[PDB]
Amino acid sequence: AKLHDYYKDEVVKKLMTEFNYNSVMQVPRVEKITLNMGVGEAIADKKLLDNAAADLAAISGQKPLITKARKSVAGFKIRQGYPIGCKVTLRGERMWEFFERLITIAVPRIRDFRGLSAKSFDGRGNYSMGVREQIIFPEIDYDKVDRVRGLDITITTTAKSDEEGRALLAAFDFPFRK
Amino acid sequence: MFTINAEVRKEQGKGASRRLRAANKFPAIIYGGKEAPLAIELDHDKVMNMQAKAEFYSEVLTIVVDGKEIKVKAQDVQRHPYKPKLQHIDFVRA
Amino acid sequence: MLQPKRTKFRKMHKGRNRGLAQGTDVSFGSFGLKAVGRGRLTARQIEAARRAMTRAVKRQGKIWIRVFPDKPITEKPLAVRMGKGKGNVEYWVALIQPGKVLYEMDGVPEELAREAFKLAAAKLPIKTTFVTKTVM
Amino acid sequence: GGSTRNGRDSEAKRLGVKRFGGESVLAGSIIVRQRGTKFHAGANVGCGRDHTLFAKADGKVKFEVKGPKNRKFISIEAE
Amino acid sequence: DKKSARIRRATRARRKLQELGATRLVVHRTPRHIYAQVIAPNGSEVLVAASTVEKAIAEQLKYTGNKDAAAAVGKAVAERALEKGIKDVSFDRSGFQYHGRVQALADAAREAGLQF
RNA sequence: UCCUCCUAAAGAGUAACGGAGGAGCACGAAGGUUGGCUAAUCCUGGUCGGACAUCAGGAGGUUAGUGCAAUGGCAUAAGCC
RNA sequence: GCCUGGCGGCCGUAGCGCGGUGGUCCCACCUGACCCCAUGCCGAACUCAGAAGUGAAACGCCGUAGCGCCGAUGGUAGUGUGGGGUCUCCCCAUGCGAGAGUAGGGAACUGCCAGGC
């Protein structure tokens, strides 16, 4: 876990060190990233969705959930039981193993962050990546892939200010504004 | 620096208070100063004519009671619900 | 005039009041008017007395009410014949006590108490007295 | 607007007052709604249903005013 | 702090145990220490106690939070109560789950002579 | 005929077409019990989504929920699983 | 004496604001996760194994009489019984007496057990 080694050395080591500051138990942290994938509207096929969901779950500690709608009646041509996502939320070891291919080789499919002007306002450094499709994460059986499902992915820190997340997340090469 | 004479009240509570409010006198008190709370009776209209100047409520004044001279300062007041007249007043020892 | 808006209730007790309330003190203006009598005051009396006082100041400032009735009284003719429950609202009523302020002002005239409040007050069911803010 | 129907059944009011006990049954007062004003403590139980101050053991009531904030207790102790 | 579900669970026991009267086992644990104390039938005195801070059982340990030491507190509180002639004690787990070190304390205390 | 509150009095009773609302059932589950959990609302932010379908975070609340009258209960949940 | 933990008692003197303060001890973060155990998925929760890191968050104590909170004496509101009147109010006799504020109080007190100095 070569990235987790660096994350415990150089990352945020100098935070407040140009000020009257010595505290060791106050550094910002991450452990989890919020995840979701486009399941569509098909429920009676199953066999095409299940295959592509398993290819995403193969890099996560989770299995895809069935889910339900929050709003369905009088507005969307559905009722309460409608399956609306799958989660597959990424946490712990597989996050620092995902960050081991992120910015090192998982770069050539995502759209470069030009025109970005994004902010954070809750003291936890909440930021969404806006990548909109799954990035064909190149682990071992990814050459067969030329068709991709829609994706939603958003990170949050263990911190007191969004200014601490602004120091921590810069190690993953996210501009905040461009 | 006002100086007024007072008497120590012989009787207290609603019935004695309404007996003291007979247009000649009215009730007052002197308390604090590490000494006991003293219940006194003051002239209804001569003291009214003296309190017509803000020093009565803003500067130290003298009360003579039991032949003893006390230095006091103003603290609180009660007045009639539609008349300017005095119903009861508080002093603290200076 | 003088009506509350969108009330939860309209049927209320007439009953009796102690007529003492609390010692005179002003809130909205530097000058006011005290009732000096006791009893009840109607919305038509409050407006008839306001209509005289606004001319006693000619066109100066605004006179603020310190009595607002919020209680409706019903009236019904003996032509239905009767006993068929209370009728429609006829007047709105407020409580008055000798220390009660009726009106307050700050934008007062320069001839105050040679016109208005102490003099030129009219249409009132009792005689009133003029009052000040006071500093003691 | 007439009549009104109003109801006419029960009073659901206190009975068990001052220092009290119960020879074979201790029940206190049998009152509706009360579950959050005064609470049972010791051998006594309720808070169904039941509306009662029933006791599972032998002892007598003294009433308590002391407790956390708004709580006051209908304490029962043996002699 | 972070324990508003554990106090929700514990408050149920405080309430239901005061309707029951008699004794309580008052079991508690931290990642460093294990504690148990038998509250007497009055609900307000300690009759017997055991913990991994008492040097009669806690000095011969390699870690004061271990399950074999939670079982040693179970053994100790049981034999101390067995010397005082006590039974039918109500198991007060202080809002925790009945598993692991709390359940090993129960299994060891049951065998060592506590009822429960 | 049945149910509740106020007028109604620092016990109860207690009159006025005085002031105002409900019932003449329904749930085999919405019963039982053990285990886990608990709202509203606003703001921020992001694909497949036409204007709006995602839920994560903060701000914050026992100001959500319960077969229905009003009264009162209820998170120790009778609320959600 | 002092420091802490549990059950708590009392429950605002136990609150708020702002500052100070502890890691021998206990306490929390913390450091990991086979097995028993757990997940409409997951060591997230629940749960286990422990000491490399820290006194931050969390936990506990305390200065501070500024506000809350408690509130004497005097007076007020009201009121039990009695006599009258100028009558749903007033006057008198005789007792009770808030609510608010003041001065004063007050930044608690404590039962059982256990660890620590």
Side-chain angles (χ1 to χ4, degrees), chain B residues 57-58 79 81-82, chain C residues 23-24 34 98 136:
Chain B
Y57 301 112
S58 317
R79 284 170 291 197
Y82 86 89
Chain C
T24 309
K34 66 177 163 191
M136 289 291 173

Side-chain angles (χ1 to χ4, degrees), chain E:
Chain E
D1 173 71
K2 298 188 297 177
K3 288 176 283 174
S4 276
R6 203 186 73 182
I7 195 173
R8 194 184 297 111
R9 295 181 240 118
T11 303
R12 192 178 91 178
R14 293 182 64 219
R15 298 280 196 272
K16 287 183 178 297
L17 292 165
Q18 199 167 84
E19 294 181 310
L20 184 59
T23 59
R24 293 171 60 201
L25 192 58
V26 187
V27 185
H28 297 264
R29 60 174 184 69
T30 66
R32 300 186 186 76
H33 297 107
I34 319 296
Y35 309 93
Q37 64 186 342
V38 179
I39 311 300
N42 75 355
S44 307
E45 286 188 319
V46 179
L47 183 58
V48 296
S51 66
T52 62
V53 296
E54 189 184 68
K55 307 308 190 300
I57 67 170
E59 177 185 70
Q60 69 208 10
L61 302 181
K62 291 187 175 181
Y63 195 73
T64 47
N66 187 278
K67 189 176 177 183
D68 182 65
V73 173
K75 289 165 177 181
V77 75
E79 70 176 281
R80 291 165 192 200
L82 189 65
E83 181 175 26
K84 298 293 193 280
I86 313 300
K87 70 177 181 174
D88 206 50
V89 180
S90 305
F91 199 101
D92 183 20
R93 72 180 186 275
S94 315
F96 286 82
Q97 185 58 253
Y98 185 78
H99 194 59
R101 292 175 277 200
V102 171
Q103 186 277 346
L105 185 152
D107 178 87
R110 170 159 176 87
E111 183 181 89
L114 184 64
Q115 301 198 334
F116 193 52

Side-chain angles (χ1 to χ4, degrees), chain D:
Chain D
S3 55
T4 59
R5 300 182 165 116
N6 187 23
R8 63 169 182 162
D9 187 84
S10 303
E11 70 194 281
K13 201 79 187 195
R14 70 186 179 218
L15 187 72
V17 291
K18 57 68 178 181
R19 295 179 169 123
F20 77 86
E23 190 74 59
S24 287
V25 174
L26 185 160
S29 300
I30 300 71
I31 64 176
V32 300
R33 300 171 184 130
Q34 211 289 95
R35 199 195 177 173
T37 320
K38 292 188 180 177
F39 306 86
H40 55 254
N44 57 357
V45 290
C47 296
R49 290 198 174 279
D50 76 72
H51 302 121
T52 305
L53 196 87
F54 183 83
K56 288 180 62 64
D58 184 60
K60 297 187 68 171
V61 174
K62 61 158 53 70
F63 293 97
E64 176 65 290
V65 63
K66 304 188 298 297
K69 305 185 189 295
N70 178 245
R71 301 200 155 211
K72 299 188 177 63
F73 299 88
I74 311 179
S75 47
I76 187 173
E77 305 189 62
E79 304 186 273

Side-chain angles (χ1 to χ4, degrees), chain A residues 61-88:
Chain A
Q62 307 309 111
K63 294 300 186 197
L65 288 175
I66 291 175
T67 75
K68 295 186 303 196
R70 173 182 70 107
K71 284 183 171 178
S72 63
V73 283
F76 302 110
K77 199 182 172 176
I78 51 163
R79 290 175 67 179
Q80 285 85 342
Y82 185 78
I84 206 164
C86 62
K87 305 183 179 277
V88 303

Side-chain angles (χ1 to χ4, degrees), chain A residues 51 55-56 58-59 101 105-109 134-148:
Chain A
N51 176 260
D55 172 77
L56 182 62
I59 63 168
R101 277 178 165 87
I105 204 65
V107 299
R109 295 185 62 90
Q134 77 90 346
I135 71 170
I136 317 180
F137 182 88
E139 184 177 79
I140 195 161
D141 200 40
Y142 57 93
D143 180 275
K144 70 187 181 184
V145 195
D146 194 48
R147 290 184 122 211
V148 292

Side-chain angles (χ1 to χ4, degrees), chain B residues 9 12-14 17-19 21 29 31-32 37 75 78 88 90:
Chain B
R9 288 178 61 210
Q12 283 133 244
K14 194 173 187 182
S17 187
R18 291 182 174 183
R19 195 177 305 105
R21 295 196 209 96
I29 52 179
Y31 60 94
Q75 183 69 353
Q78 303 184 6
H88 172 59
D90 289 35

